[PDB]
Design a protein around this nucleic acid. Structure first.
Length: 1008
RNA sequence: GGUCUGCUAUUUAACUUUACGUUUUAGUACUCUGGAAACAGAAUCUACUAAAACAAGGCAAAAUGCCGUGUU
DNA sequence: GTAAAGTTAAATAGCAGAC
């Protein structure tokens, strides 16, 4: 039948409600679920560029060692084992050097080649590790002496060269690398092309328009295709590409608006005519960069005060379009031949904004075959500010630029008068975030599939869902780890300056963290009338104040004798904060300040009209656009999220929302009952009309009337009763997931024969880290310093007992002495301890990459080996299964195949045979029938232990347990066995229906 | 509501480089051991410096060379 | 795995004059 389509949009879940348009009976209802998306996994695109950065240093070195073999300065015979290249680049400038002592000083340079960006600017020294500070410091010390020399001077005195101080400009390197080759030049016969090719292999590097190579998708073919897919498309003619915001024509179209909006009190026509608009441009606008209002109004003989209809900046001066082409070109060239012609000027600006280097401009300024003296082109490339793009293509400037001249029209009315109009995959281009992009995309698929099984609905009503550098400051200032839970309380504490707005007494942070129960988060305007769950409605106050207030407005509760403070002192302290910077929200100020009574109804419907009703804007218009394009009539509206935190409340819906996933599909039905109430009433057809944004009556008059319309506790009895919910869980078939964690671990072998991972306690002398204290006093047998070289250890343990009352005795130690923990030595020459390795838990699974490293005595592994999938097999009445890991699926050019070398070994290692029947595969989140019982596959807990972990469907197991109160270990770990009676694979469509799948063969190839 | 424009703040895609971090090897320092020392081997915790790998791998052949943890 | 220097571009937010 006809039905309303309700939808709850969260990040993890899509819920839908299907209630009939008339009978109010519900046809179907379910929830579609998936894991939240992550944009922090920035790494994929950065590492793609960051991996090439490691190649940028690596490519330079490989080329110069190979280039020397071609020049025959180095051969495979040569040995470089002994060099100390920080001395070779000092003996190199002074004296003749070998063919082995010269290739090193070159290559150590070729590897570490400095920056170009940082040289240009300098700064002062502010006791920091900046790059504008360090290179500013470095070259003053290096003004007299060259890079290596001071580095070598630094080697002689500090004992350490590498670190923060070793950044440099590519110049000093190149200036000294031009200084060096000047000395060995006569000692080994060589060309100038070598002091060209090498100095090009040491300094030269890419820039933001060359892109990577040809085969890369990330790479492009020329400078034209770079911009030709980074510039937007016309608001009216999107098939073209946006013109440059600074082309002469656009810069002119942007001025024929300036004056076609002007109104002037003249007995003649108020909006300037063509000859007026001609000479003004030609006599004063062309002649003067910025024209103040006087200049136009003087050349056009009217009084200065008269002209109105002009854009004005905040200071008050009128702003009219600046011709960027004329004055940059006319400041060096006034010749009749380019300057009159707009098309000449039109192309010039395009080349300037597109290509980005003065040298690359003159090449393309030349291929125009236009007639500019070549002295101009080489200084026309020395101008700046030719940046940005108009929001209108060139096919939309030249078409209507004439009709701006003669008439007095402006751009909007011309496009109206010219019958020209603005404009799942479609979600990507405009949408903001990966979190939303996932929810919408699956929500569309829901609709696109519901109508196919159910038909065209009539009403599709949709609701959406509703400073971590501040946390790092107080878990480090105070030392209280638990700063993670009370974010919404603390963001309020900065924004209110440590006071209680309903008491005006100070709220110490240390006191609030110790006693959070002392201080609550009161809702300014009550949740029951405001319906504002946003930040703005919340104010961190003392409990006793919010306790004494209750269900009232601040003005009410402050004015009464119950509150000791008064509105008068409240009114003055409130606004002072409001003005300034880092200031309080405005709806906040609109919230605290309102003085009208809540019960009068001419007040209540204002709130419901304001916050409660009315990407959201974007999502809706992709829906109405589908419907309007197809001449298909279905009404689609929206409603804010807080409404369903209300309708749930007034109808006494369940507070203890612990039933699980179905507390979504519950919402969509409520959303559906809501639009129904909007629908049926005629006292609601003025508020239910702008929600569908239709072009146009009864409205509600007292608060009992409203409370008559949206309080129906008795007629909703069908929703709680509903028992046919069907669930659908998203399965991630995608490969090229994160193969494994980045960090490399070393290992050892203990006395027993286990293989054991070693870790690093990196930062020392930090107030946060007490783990130096914790791990010493429980199992110090894990410290490498304790096992051998314990002589350093007893010095370590004594400070851990000397300041054993302070969280990290080392800061307290470094506080006193001002000297780091020194390794044991006879004459105080022991190296400072800056890390301390320690043993780890035995590595069950590892990625062995030792072969990348030679002659190592220990194994080198990256942890976080993961299992991808697992195909159950049926081996003659006994159920066995293989597990296939993430590491196994080898990547390729356009597909991700499975390694039959490891899968086959895994078939023998699992005692699988050739004769066994094959049962389907079970990726994470797929559903399985073991012993007639159905659960969702979280994954293989242990291939070796013959285990998988599953979780429940209508609920998470922990939550089922919390309902059962059993307190077993809250995870399911069913054990595959010979005893297991049945293995069937169930999956679900997006709607939530369950279907049995029959499988005959296993696949090893995925295309991504 | 929307179209242009002017100022400032925002975020996101893509690109370009940086000095560190982990780890292996060789050296030295530190530690043990033998001794009047020259030094000697033992360990590889502790540090420094250099070379090399840093998702397994896959292309590509004189190259300012390329992909590899994201989403659909 | 991680901090410090760059650039182009798409887009929104907020402020102003117009239709």
């Amino acid at each position: 039948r006809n039905y309303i389509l309700g939808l709850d949009i969260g990040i993890t879940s899509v819920g839908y409600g299907i209630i009939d348009y008339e009978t109010r009976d519900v046809i179907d209802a379910g929830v579609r679920l998936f894991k939240e998306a992550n944009v922090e996994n920035e790494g994929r695109r950065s590492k793609r560029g960051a991996r090439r950065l490691k190649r940028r240093r690596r490519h330079r070195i490989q080329r110069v060692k190979k280039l020397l073999f071609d020049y025959n300065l180095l051969t495979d015979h040569s040995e470089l084992s002994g060099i100390n290249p920080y001395e070779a680049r000092v003996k190199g400038l002074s004296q003749k050097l070998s063919e082995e002592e010269f290739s090193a000083a070159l290559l150590h340079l070729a590897k570490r080649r400095g920056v170009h960006n940082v040289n240009e600017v300098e700064e002062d020294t502010g006791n920091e590790l900046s790059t504008k500070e360090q290179i500013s410091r470095n070259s003053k010390a290096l003004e007299e002496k060259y890079v290596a020399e001071l580095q070598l001077e630094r080697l002689k005195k500090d004992g350490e060269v590498r670190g923060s101080i070793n950044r440099f400009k590519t110049s000093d390197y190149v200036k000294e690398a031009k200084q060096l080759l000047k000395v060995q030049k006569a000692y080994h016969q060589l060309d100038q092309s070598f002091i060209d090719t090498y100095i090009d292999l040491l300094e030269t590097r890419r820039t933001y328009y060359e892109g990577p190579g040809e085969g890369s998708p990330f790479g492009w073919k020329d400078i034209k295709e770079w911009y030709e897919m980074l510039m937007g498309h016309c608001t009216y003619f999107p098939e073209e590409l946006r013109s440059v915001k600074y082309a002469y024509n656009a810069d002119l179209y942007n001025a024929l608006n300036d004056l076609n909006n002007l109104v002037i009190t003249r007995d003649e026509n108020e909006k300037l005519e063509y000859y007026e608009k001609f000479q003004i441009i030609e006599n004063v606008f062309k002649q003067k960069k910025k024209p103040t209002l006087k200049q136009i109004a003087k050349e056009i003989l009217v009084n200065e005060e008269d002209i109105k209809g002009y854009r004005v900046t905040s200071t008050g001066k009128p702003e009219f379009t600046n011709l960027k082409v004329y004055h940059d070109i006319k400041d060096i060239t006034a010749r009749k031949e380019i300057i009159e012609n707009a098309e000449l000027l039109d192309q010039i600006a395009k080349i300037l904004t597109i290509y980005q280097s003065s040298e690359d401009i003159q090449e393309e300024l030349t291929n125009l075959n236009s007639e500019l003296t070549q002295e101009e082109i080489e200084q026309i490339s020395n101008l700046k500010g030719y940046t940005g793009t108009h929001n209108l293509s060139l096919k939309a400037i030249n078409l209507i630029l004439d009709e701006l001249w003669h008439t007095n029209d402006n751009q909007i009315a011309i496009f109206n008068r010219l019958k020209l109009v603005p404009k799942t995959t479609l979600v990507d281009d405009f949408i903001l975030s990966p979190v939303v992009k996932r929810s919408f995309i699956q929500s569309i698929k829901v609709i696109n599939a519901i109508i196919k099984k159910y038909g065209l609905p009539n009403d599709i009503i949709i609701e959406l869902a509703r400073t971590n550098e501040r946390i790092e400051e107080i878990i480090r200032t105070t030392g209280k780890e638990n700063a993670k839970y009370l974010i919404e309380k603390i963001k309020l504490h900065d924004m209110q300056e440590g006071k209680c707005l309903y008491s005006l007494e100070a709220i110490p942070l240390e006191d609030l963290l110790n006693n959070p129960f002392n201080y609550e988060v009161d809702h300014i305007i009550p949740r029951s009338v405001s319906f504002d769950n946003s930040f703005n409605n919340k104010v961190l106050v003392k409990q006793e104040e919010a306790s004494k207030k209750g269900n009232r407005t601040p003005f009410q509760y402050l004015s009464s004798s119950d509150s000791k403070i008064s509105y008068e002192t409240f009114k003055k302290h409130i606004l002072n904060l409001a003005k300034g910077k880092g200031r309080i929200s405005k709806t906040k100020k609109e919230y605290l300040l309102e003085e009208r009574d809540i019960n009068r109804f001419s007040v209540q419907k204002d709130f419901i009209n304001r916050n409660l009703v009315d990407a959201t804007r974007g999502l809706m218009n992709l829906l109405r656009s589908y419907f309007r394009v197809n001449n298909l009539d279905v009404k689609v509206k929206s409603i804010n999220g807080g409404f369903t935190s209300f309708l749930r409340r007034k109808w006494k819906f369940k507070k203890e929302r612990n039933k699980g996933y179905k507390h979504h599909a519950e919402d969509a039905l409520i959303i559906a009952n809501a639009d129904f109430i909007f629908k049926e009433w005629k006292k609601l057809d003025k508020a239910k009309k702008v929600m569908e944004n239709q072009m146009f009556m009864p409205e509600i008059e007292t608060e009992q009337e409203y409370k008559e319309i949206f309080i129906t506790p008795h007629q909703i009895k069908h929703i709680k009763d509903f028992k046919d919910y069907k669930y659908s869980h998203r399965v991630d078939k995608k490969p090229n997931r994160e193969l494994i964690n980045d960090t490399l671990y070393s290992t050892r072998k203990d006395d027993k024969g286990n293989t054991l991972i070693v870790n690093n306690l990196n930062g020392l002398y930090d107030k946060d880290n007490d783990k130096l204290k914790k791990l010493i006093n429980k199992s110090p047998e894990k410290l490498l310093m304790y096992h051998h070289d314990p002589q350093t250890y007893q010095k370590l343990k004594l400070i851990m007992e000397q300041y054993g009352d302070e969280k990290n005795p080392l800061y307290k130690y470094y506080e006193e002495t001002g000297n780091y923990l020194t390794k044991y030595s006879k004459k105080d020459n022991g190296p400072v301890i800056k890390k301390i390795k320690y043993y780890g838990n035995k590595l069950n699974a590892h990625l062995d990459i030792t072969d990348d490293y030679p002659n190592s005595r220990n194994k080198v592994v990256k942890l976080s080996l993961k299992p991808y999938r697992f195909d159950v097999y049926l081996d003659n009445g006994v159920y066995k299964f293989v597990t296939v890991k993430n590491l196994d699926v080898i990547k390729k050019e356009n597909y991700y195949e499975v390694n039959s070398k490891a899968y086959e070994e895994a078939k023998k290692l699992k005692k699988i045979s050739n004769q066994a029947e094959f049962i389907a595969s079970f990726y994470n989140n797929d559903l399985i029938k073991i012993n007639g019982e159905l659960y969702r596959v979280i994954g293989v807990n242990n291939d070796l232990l013959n285990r998988i972990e599953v979780n429940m469907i209508d609920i998470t197991y922990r939550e089922y347990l919390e309902n059962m109160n059993d307190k077993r270990p809250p995870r399911i770990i069913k054990t595959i066995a010979s005893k297991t009676q049945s293995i069937k694979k169930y999956s679900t469509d997006i709607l939530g229906n369950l279907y049995e799948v029959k499988s005959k063969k296993h696949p090893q190839i995925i295309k991504k």
